[PDB]
């Protein structure tokens, strides 16, 4: 957004006004990496209690 796009103007006067420029703002979508810690799944424990490992 141009901050001073509209400015008070004196028709009687003729002073120079600073040249203005248009700039471009950028958005951002950060990537988040997730995971799961190593979960121990020994077949022995399930087999000891007769459970499908």
């Amino acid at each position: 957004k141009i901050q001073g796009l509209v400015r008070p103007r004196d028709p009687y006067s003729n002073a120079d006004v600073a040249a203005k420029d248009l700039r471009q703002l950028v958005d951002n979508t950060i990537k988040v990496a997730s995971g799961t810690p190593p979960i121990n799944i020994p077949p022995s424990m399930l087999r000891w209690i007769q459970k499908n490992p």
Binding site: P43, S44, R47, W48, Q50, P53
Partner: protein, 54 residues
């Protein structure tokens, strides 16, 4: 007489060596093999040849 070279039947050596004979009756011993057998084949790299274990 069912003879077997079982270590469970030998205890000691020389003079301390003793033997054990079991007069088992019917159903004296019971082996209930649970169907919980498991096995794995883990192969490995980082060597001249693939290192596979069982």
């Amino acid at each position: 007489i069912i003879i077997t070279d079982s270590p469970a039947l030998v205890s000691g050596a020389a003079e301390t060596l003793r033997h054990s004979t079991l007069g088992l009756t019917t159903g004296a011993i019971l082996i209930e093999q649970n169907q919980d057998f498991d096995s794995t084949v883990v192969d490995g790299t980082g060597k001249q040849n693939i290192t596979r274990q069982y």
